[PDB]
Amino acid sequence: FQWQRNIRKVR
């Protein structure tokens, strides 16, 4: 799941 905006992580 390639995050859209430079995100940290999806816990």
- The tokens describing 7, both together, are 């995100």
- The tokens describing 11, both together, are 């816990």
Distance of CA 4 to the CA centre of its chain: 6
Residue 10 contacts residue 1 (beta carbons within 8 Å): yes
Provide CB contacts within 8 A for 1, sequence distance 6+.
10
Residue 10 contacts residue 3 (beta carbons within 8 Å): yes
DSSP state of 4: S
Helix runs in the chain, H state only:
none
Specify the residue for token string 């940290």. 8
